[PDB]
Amino acid sequence: DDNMRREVQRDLLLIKHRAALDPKRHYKKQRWEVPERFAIGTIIEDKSEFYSSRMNRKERKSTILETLMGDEASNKYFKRKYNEIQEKST
Amino acid sequence: LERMFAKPFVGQLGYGHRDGVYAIAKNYGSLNKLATGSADGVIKYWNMSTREEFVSFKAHYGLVTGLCVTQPRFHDKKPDLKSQNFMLSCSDDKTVKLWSINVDDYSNKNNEEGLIRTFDGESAFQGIDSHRENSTFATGGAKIHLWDVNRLKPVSDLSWGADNITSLKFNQNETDILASTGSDNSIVLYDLRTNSPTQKIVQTMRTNAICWNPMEAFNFVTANEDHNAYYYDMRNLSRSLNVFKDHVSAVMDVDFSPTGDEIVTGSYDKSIRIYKTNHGHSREIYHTKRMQHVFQVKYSMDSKYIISGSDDGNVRLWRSKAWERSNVKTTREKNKLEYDEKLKERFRHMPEIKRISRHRHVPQVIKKAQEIKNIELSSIKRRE
C-alpha cells in the first residue's frame, strides 16, 4: 500500500537493476516486473553463525539502499564508473 | 446405438507365447485361471484378472499337444485344493507331465513349484482330457489310454481299431461318457463304467474338435473340416440336430457357453464366429489384422468373454456380446437396456432393422471367398 512508499519503491528499483551494482556478479537475464504482493523482511541468523553470517548491529540499516550506500567499496566503484560514463557523455 | 457401441475387443493376455497357441484349457472351478500351451514347448498359467502369468514352465522338447487343468485326488495325502492348482501337459515326445502352480487365491498359509509327476509313454500323445470328480485322465495317442494319477503305467486301453486318435473330450454331466475324434475321420463315443468303446460314426471329412454341451448332457458339436459345425445328439447318431455353416476354411475349435445356448467357433481362416444353437447361422464374426489362424477358442466360465488363442503367439480375449459392459448398472439403466433388447428382438425382421443389424464389416478375403463358395454351390445345385 501507499506508506513507506518512497523507500520501498527505491528498493524495488534497486532489485530490478541489480545487475549493475557489482562488476563481479552477473546474474541471469530476467525482466522482473514488480510483483502483485510482497513483504519486505529481515534475515535472522542462527546462533550457530556468530562469526560467519552474523552481520553487525551498527551496520544493520533499515533499507537495502541505505546499507548499499553505507558500504564503501561499492561507493568508490560507483564514483569511478560514474565519472567514466559522465566523461564519455560530455 | 448397438451398432455404434459394438466394441468386442477388450485386451490380450500379456506378451503371450512365442510360436503360436495350440492348447488352451480353462479352469472349470475358478474363473481367472487358464492355461495356454505353445508349439514351442512352454506352458503358462494365466491370471486373466490382472492379465498376467503365475509361472511359465518350459515343459517339453516337442510341441504341446494337449493341456488340462485339475486337482488330483492323491491317496498319500490330500493336496491343497486352495493354495495350489494343477496342470497336466500332454507332449509330443511321449510324455505326460503333471505340474503344481502356487496360487495366491487364498491367504491362509505361510515349496513344490513344478513337475509333480511324469508319465513316460510308448506312442506320441496327441490329445488329453480329465475325467472330473474322479481325477482320471484319458490321453489319445495312437490308441487312447485311460490313466490314473497315482499309477505311472496306463491303467486301461481303449481302442476301436488300430488307427490313431486326434482328440478327446469328456462330457460335463453324466461324466462317464467320453468322445473321441480319430484321423480316419471318425467320431467314436467311449464309455467308462463299461470300460469300452460304444459307438462309431464315420463322416466324410475329419472333425478337428468336439465339445459337449453343459446343459443337456447328450448333445455335442463337432468342428468339422468341411467348413462346418455339426450339432449331434448322442442316442440318434444317424443324423445331426443342426449344421452351422458360415465359415470359409477349416473350423479349428468349438465351445459351448456355460448357459448352454451359444457356440463359438474358431477357424483356420483368421476369424472367429458366434452362433446360437437355434438359428444355424453366424450371429457375429470377430476378426483382426493382428490375429491369424485361430487354432483354439474357449468360451469363458461366467459366460461373458471368449478367449481365443491364435497361432501368431497371442491369446486375445473378447466380449461375448459387444455391449454388455462389466460395470454394475443402476436399475433405471438396466431396465432401459433390457427394454431396448426386447424391443429389437420383437422388431428384428423388419427390412431396415435387418439391414443395419446384419451390416457387419468382414475382411475382403473372407467376403470374396464366401461369394466364390456361393457361386460353386449354386452351380452344383443346378447340375443336381
Binding site: - | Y15, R18, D19, K289, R290, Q292, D312, G313, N314
Partner: protein
Amino acid sequence: AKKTRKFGLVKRTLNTKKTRNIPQVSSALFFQYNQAIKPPYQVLIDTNFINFSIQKKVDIVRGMMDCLLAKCNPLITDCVMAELEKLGPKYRIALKLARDPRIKRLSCSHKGTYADDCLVHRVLQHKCYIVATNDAGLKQRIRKIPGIPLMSVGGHAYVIEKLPDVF
C-alpha cells in the same frame, strides 16, 4: 482496403520506415560425445531393421555382436511389435524372430501405433539407447538429434555410424 489505397499505404510505409520449457542438455554429453554409452549396449530395434536382417540373413544378436564387438541387448517396443503384427502373414518369420527370450520387450504408453514417433521420443528422453534401422526419414531425424549412435543394416552385416568406439 482498395488496391490503390493499398499501393498508397505501401508507398507511405516504405517512406516512413526509411510458462516456457527449455529441456536441459543431458549430463551424458561432452559436446557430441555421449559418454553414457559403454558396453553392454542397449539397442532399439525397428521393423525395417528386422526385415532387412531377414533379407540379408544376418542374425540379430550374433550379427550385432559381430558389428559392435560387445554384448548388445536389443529392445522392442509395443509400437514396433504391433507394426510387425499388422504386417502379418507374409512376415510371419520376422514375427517369430522378434518374439524371443533374449529380445527384452519394453512397454509404452501411446495413443497410436507410430513407431517412428515412439522411438524419436524415447531417444529424446533418455540418450542411452542406440537406434537400429534402415529407414531414411527416421535416419534423418535421429541424425539431427545430437549424440545418438545410429546403426543401419547394409551390405553383408550391420554398420554403425555415430559411435566413437566402433573399434
